Amino acid sequence: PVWSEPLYSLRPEHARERLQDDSVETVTSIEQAKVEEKIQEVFSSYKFNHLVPRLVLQREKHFHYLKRGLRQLTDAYECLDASRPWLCYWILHSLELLDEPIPQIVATDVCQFLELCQSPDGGFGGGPGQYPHLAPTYAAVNALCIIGTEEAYNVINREKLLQYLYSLKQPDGSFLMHVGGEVDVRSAYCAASVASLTNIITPDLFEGTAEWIARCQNWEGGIGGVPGMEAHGGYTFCGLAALVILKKERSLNLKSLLQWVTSRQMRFEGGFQGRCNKLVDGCYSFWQAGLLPLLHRALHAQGDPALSMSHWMFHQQALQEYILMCCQCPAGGLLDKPGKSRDFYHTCYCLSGLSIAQHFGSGAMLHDVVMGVPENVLQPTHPVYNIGPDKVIQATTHFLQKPVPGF
Amino acid sequence: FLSLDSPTYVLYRDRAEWADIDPVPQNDGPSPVVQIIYSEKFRDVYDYFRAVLQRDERSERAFKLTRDAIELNAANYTVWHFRRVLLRSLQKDLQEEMNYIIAIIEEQPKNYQVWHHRRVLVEWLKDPSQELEFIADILNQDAKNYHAWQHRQWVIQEFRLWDNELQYVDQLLKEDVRNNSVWNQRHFVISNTTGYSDRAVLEREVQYTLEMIKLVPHNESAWNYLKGILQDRGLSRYPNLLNQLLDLQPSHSSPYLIAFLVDIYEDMLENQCDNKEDILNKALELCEILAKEKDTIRKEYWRYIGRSLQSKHSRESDIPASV
Ligand SMILES: N#Cc1ccc2c(c1)CN(S(=O)(=O)c1cccs1)[C@H](Cc1ccccc1)CN2Cc1c[nH]cn1
Ligand SMILES: CC(C)=CCC/C(C)=C/CC/C(C)=C/COP(=O)(O)OP(=O)(O)O
Ligand SMILES: [Zn+2]
């Protein structure tokens, strides 16, 4: 119909999705209202300017932002001086999704830089001369696999990495983030991620890990940083993804989890919140929404016959609308929410989420949903590692031809 | 003893007491990637940090240097590790260090490293006497600080300081009944104290929740808490629940109450209830009402539940193909 609105967020019924504070005001409702009000302005802008809406992913603009940052950053990133491998990964992955080639001049410089970050004793640090840490180690391995050239693969010292992983392993199945450091679900995932890709997973490395992760699932259905903590999207993704790698998804109450994540998508904004009663955030377009592909795979593994065959269990269209209309910086790069400044973290995850929301894949079945102009379609991303599905296969296929340190 | 923000602050290369040290510039290689264009102050401090770290110089001046390196980037875990080495080697007064970390956390509360550092201190000192109050102050500025609640749970568990937490929880829920972190803390205190098997306790909790739900019908936290404390024993295990929720649809309705209804029906069908088919259809109509009207953002979920429930509870679900 001519009166019909193709964009879900601009339909008149949508207004009914605004917050109902039951005339009881608290800091949470006041805060949620401010955001909704700001998002409504964005949605309504087309009607007020008398323009027909067009959802365009600003490719060239994001490419410039990425291209440059990959080589140089302002002092605004001094706070990430101990996370340089993360910067490499987020940027290289954003380019990968945007489908931009990685010049060999760059691939080699990247490889060399990560070598400088690698520790004599295994794992990578957040920068040259810094002690190793599982987070920058997970990023380094990922960045190298994205490059995926023989040179990149050879940067990784597999015997040392394994030694390192063991030196962090705890009696209760968990892992320290680094020597003398803290423990949380993130370490489980970082370890599982790098150990599986490089094929250094011994019979006892992750003993008890699946059980420890399972202990992090709480009364909410979601997973918390450590046993007993509020359910959070970032940690939940970490827990499920790790279990998927360990083939222990069933250790969790997948049902209560599925219900928890599906409730994390905002009815009005369209994007996801990190935890119940907080604000929407573009990066959760990945941590939260990225869970559905994981769940679909687990439930399907269990023969679940109700699973859709063309969509994930979240409003794909509404998420693309949030990202596209509310998360792009006109100057390039993406962000948390309208009003927030751009950064590479959000560029990486807003795009990863967009890709996931555009591509449905369950074996033979393949259905896409691309909001806005077709040029908006991105390269698909693997829901466990968050690098090209191709890079995952290629990487593992290369290291599987190597003996697991020790044999 | 010269703050990183003092107007008379001087770069380290211009300090007499540091003339003997050659700064160690950062080894970024021939052609850098993700190279950060540091400010003069930042690069100066870290060039000297790199030197002390390299020589593993355990000195009072190195100790003071780490404070500046930390303030420039509190996320540099390598510097925090060296600082802890110096705290022990130099036998530094840990209460003074406690004074320091509470100041840093007040300043940058959403950093992983500062909280981990405080935890290490509390452990070393084996003294949690200041923890609940300090955290309460942080929480008073951000009632949802994830690291704050995590530290609070650790301290309470490791030192068994359960006695007043429920009271604290009641205070914050009053301030903001929508604070999901507090509902989580509530479930935390009860689970580790009385537990929810004590019928008097469980009863109390559900009463409280329903009470809250009445006051703020659309606050999802109360609803999730209610489902959380009853879902393990089984929703169908509580026959009066359904009727009491139905007596809310009139006025106190929400897509939340409807979703709960489906949950109850689902569990009922899962325990061969009376009028199996009648219950099923009641659930399928609610699923559709939610997927197409009350909770459309979750249309895919609801349609899934719709299929699931029919896939295994239709009268023909356990009937042979040939029949
Ligand atoms: N660019 C960039 C950037 C921006 C924020 C940020 C992170 C990176 C990664 N880290 S963090 O601890 O290093 C930071 C927190 C605050 C500033 S950087 C934080 C924790 C993290 C670290 C590494 C991988 C994933 C998450 C996440 N954040 C804070 C945030 C994101 N969304 C809402 N809050
Ligand atoms: C692979 C890997 C290392 C993943 C990490 C996942 C992740 C995003 C963790 C962060 C969780 C957290 C402590 C948020 C607090 O900030 P906040 O209070 O601003 O968050 P919120 O309001 O969005 O919940
Ligand atoms: Zn974010």
Q: If you search the block for the tokens 């380019």, which residue do you land on?
A: A95
Selection from B180, B297, B293 nearest residue A279 by Cα = B180
Please, which residues bridge with residue A73 across strands?
B36
Specify whether the CB–CB gap between A61 and A332 falls below 8 A. yes
Burial level of B275, CB count in 10 A (0-12/13-18/19+)? exposed
Count other C-beta atoms under 10 Å from residue B186's C-beta.
23
Contacts B224 to A, Cβ<8 Å: 219-220, 263, 276
Q: How far is the CA of B110 from the centre of ligand 1 (A)?
A: 10
Q: Which residue of B26, B150, B299 is in closest CB contact with A315?
A: B299
3-state DSSP call for residue B317?
coil
* Residue A144 buriedness (CB in 10 A; 0-12 / 13-18 / 19+): buried
CATH code of A323's domain: 1.50.10.20
User: Measured between CB atoms, which of A78, A180, A312 is closest to B36?
Assistant: A78
Rounded Cα–Cα distance for residues A285 and B82 (Å): 37
**Nearby residues of A153 by Cβ (< 8 Å), 6 or more positions away:** A144, A145, A395, A398, A399
| Residues A217, A180: Cα–Cα separation, whole Å | 25
Name the architecture of domain B1-323: Alpha Horseshoe (1.25)
Pairwise CA distance, residues A30 & A26, whole Å: 6
Query: A183 - beta bridge partners?
Result: A176
Q: In 3D, which of B205, B322, B318, B223 has the Cα closest to residue B272?
A: B318
Strand partners, A169: A175
Measured in degrees and rounded to the nearest 5, phi and psi for residue A5 equal -110, 115
Cβ(A125)–Cβ(A131) below 8 Å = yes
Token pair belonging to B3: 């703050």
3-state SS, chain A, equals CCCCCCCHHHCHHHHHHCCCCCCCCCHHHHHHHHHHHHHHHHHHHHHHHCCCCCCCCCHHHHHHHHHHHCCEECHHHHHHCCCHHHHHHHHHHHHHHHCCCCCHHHHHHHHHHHHHHECCCCCEECCCCCCECHHHHHHHHHHHHHHCCHHHHHHCCHHHHHHHHHHHECCCCCEECCCCCCECHHHHHHHHHHHHHCCCCCCCCCCCHHHHHHHCECCCCCECCCCCCCCCHHHHHHHHHHHHHHCCHHHCCHHHHHHHHHCCECCCCCCEECCCCCCECCCHHHHCCCHHHHHHHHHHHCCCCCCCCCCCCCCHHHHHHHHHHHCECCCCCECCCCCCCCCHHHHHHHHHHHHHHHEEEECCEEEECCCCCHHHCCCCCCCCCCCCHHHHHHHHHHHCCCCCCCC
Find the helix or strand (DSSP H, E) in which B320 lies.
none
Q: Would you say A361 is a known binding-site residue?
A: no
Give dist(CA B296, CA B274) in Å, integer: 30
DSSP class of residue B29? -
Q: Which of residues 20-79 of B touch A (CB under 8 A)?
A: 26-39, 42, 46, 50, 53, 72-73, 75-78
Question: At CA B88, angle to CA B85 and CA B89, rounded to 5?
Answer: 80
**How far away, in angstroms, is A233 Cα from ligand 3 center?**
11
CA–CA separation, A126 vs A134, rounded Å? 10
- Pocket of ligand 1 contains residue A319 by CB under 6 Å: no
Amino acid at B280: L
Cβ A134 under 6 angstroms from ligand 2: no
Ligand nearest to the CA of A341: 1
Cα→Cα distances B201→B187, B190, B194, Å: 12, 9, 8
Which residues 255-294 of B have a C-beta within 8 angstroms of A?
A: none
- Name the B residues in 92-111 with CB < 8 Å from any A CB: none
Contacts of A68 (CB under 8 A, 6+ apart): none
Dist CA B33 CA A207 (whole Å) = 37
CA B107 to chain centre: 19
- Which 3 state secondary structure label does DSSP give B316? coil
CB atoms within 10 A of CB B295: 22
If you search the block for the tokens 């604070």, which residue do you land on? B179
CA-based torsion, A300, A304, A310, A313: positive or negative: negative
Token output for A149: 């050239």
Task: Say yes or no for a CB contact (<8 Å) between B26 and A277.
Answer: no
B36 SS3 class:
strand
Judged by DSSP in three states, B227 sits in: helix
Beta partners for A328?
A: A334
* Centre of ligand 1 from the C-alpha of residue A317, in Å: 26
Q: How many CB atoms lie within 10 A of CB A402?
A: 12
Residues of chain B positioned with their CB less than 8 A from the CB of A29: 178
CA–centroid distance, B175 to ligand 2, in Å, is 24
What is the rounded CA–CA span in Å between residue A307 and residue A309? 6
A3 is annotated as contributing to ligand binding = no
Cα gap A247→A240, rounded to integer Å:
10
Rounded to an integer, what distance in angstroms lies between the CA atom of residue B79 and that of residue B63? Answer: 10
**Amino acid identity for residue A377 in this structure:** V
User: How far apart are the CA of A77 and the centre of ligand 1, in A?
Assistant: 11
Alpha helices in chain B (DSSP H): 40-55, 60-72, 77-89, 94-107, 112-125, 131-139, 146-159, 165-175, 180-192, 199-215, 220-230, 239-246, 255-269, 276-289, 299-313
What distance in Å separates the CA atoms of residue A217 and residue A225, rounded to the nearest whole number?
9
Give Cα separations from A108 to A68, A151, A187, B226 (angstroms).
Answer: 17, 8, 28, 55
- Taking contacts as CB-CB distances below 8 angstroms, the residues of chain A near B218 are 19-22
Which are the contacts of B90, defined by CB distance < 8 A and separation ≥ 6?
B58, B59, B60, B63
How many Å is the Cα radius of gyration of chain A? 21
State the Cα angle at B3 between B97 and B43, rounded to 5°.
105
Residue with tokens 């972190």: B181
Establish whether B110 is a catalytic residue.
yes
CA count, 13 A, side-chain hemisphere, A21: 14
Task: Give me the phi and psi of A226, to 5 degrees please.
Answer: -140, 160
Interface of A with B in 281-340 (CB under 8 A): 304-308, 311-315, 318
Cα–Cα distance, A257 to A248 (Å, whole number): 14
**CA of A166 relative to ligand 2 center, distance in Å:** 26
| CA nearest neighbour of A123 among A109, A139, A107 | A139
Residue showing tokens 């360990």 = A246
Residues of chain B found within 8 Å of residue A15, distances taken between Cβ atoms: none
Handedness of CA B83, B85, B89, B94 (dihedral sign): positive
CB-based contact A177:A187 (threshold 8 Å):
yes
Residues 6+ apart with CB under 8 A from B60: B90
CA distance A91 to A98: 10
Distance CA A302, CA A293 (A): 14
* Preferred mutation among B34, B80, B309 to probe A, highest tally of A CBs within 10 A: B34
* Residue B59 three-state SS: coil
* Pairing status of strand B35-36 against strand A72-73: parallel
Residue B33: strand, helix, or coil? coil
What 3-state class would DSSP assign to B19?
coil
Q: Is A277 marked as binding a ligand?
A: yes
- The burial class, CB within 10 Å (0-12 / 13-18 / 19+), for A38 is middle
For the four alpha carbons of A114, A120, A122 and A124, in that order, the dihedral sign comes to: negative
Locate tokens 């209202």: which residue?
A: A33
Judge: A225–B33 Cβ closer than 8 Å, yes or no. Answer: no
The H-or-E segment that residue B318 falls in is: none
Residue type, B93: D
Closest listed residue to residue A339, CA positions, set A47, A38, A9, A30? A38
Bridge partners, residue A118, by sequence:
A124
Q: A175 in ligand 1 pocket by Cβ < 6 Å?
A: no
Q: Which residues of A touch B42 (CB under 8 A)?
A: 75, 78, 81
Contacts of A345 (CB under 8 A, 6+ apart): A86, A90, A283
DSSP B294: I
Selection from A312, A320, A235, A236 nearest residue A282 by Cα: A320
- Residues paired with residue A217 on neighbouring β-strands, in sequence order: A223
Q: Residue B286 corresponds to which tokens in the numbers above?
A: 């609610």
Gaps in chain A (C to N over 2.5 angstroms) fall after: none
Assess contact for A124 and A140: CB atoms under 8 A.
Answer: yes
B-interface mutation test, from A13, A23, A113, A117, most B Cβ less than 10 A away: A113
* Ligand 1 atom having least distance to the Cα of A90: 1
Closest chain B residue by Cα to residue A125: B78
Which of the 8 DSSP states describes residue B35?
E
Which residues of chain B have a CB within 8 Å of the CB of A281?
A: none
Q: What CA–CA distance (Å, rounded) separates A158 from A389?
A: 22
Q: How far is CA A120 from the centre of its chain?
A: 29
Distance of alpha carbon B77 from alpha carbon B68, whole angstroms: 14
Exposure string of A310-342, with b = 16+ CB inside 10 Å and e = fewer, is ebbbbbbbbbbbbbbbbbbbeebbbbbbeeeeb
Q: Are A314 and A262 in contact (CB under 8 A)?
A: yes
CA A371 to CA B133: how far, in whole Å?
A: 50
Overall number of domains in chain A: 1
> In b/e form, how buried is each residue of B61-89, taking b as 16+ CB within 10 angstroms?
ebbebbbbbbebbbbbbbbbbbbbbbbee
Query: If you count them, how many residues does chain A have?
Result: 407
**Phi, psi at A127, each rounded to 5°:** 180, 165
Domain hosting A255: range is 1-407
Domain ranges of chain B: 1-323
User: Residues A178, A322, A336, A348: which is the catalytic one?
Assistant: A336
Nearest CA in chain B to A253: B232
Cβ of residue A234 lying under 6 Å from some atom of ligand 2: yes
B126/B114 Cα distance (integer angstroms): 18
Alpha-carbon distance B71 to A127, whole Å? 18
Residue of A345, A347, A385 to mutate, ligand 1, most atoms within 8 A of C-beta: A345
Asked how this structure was determined, the answer is: X-ray
Distance CA A332, CA A62 (A): 4
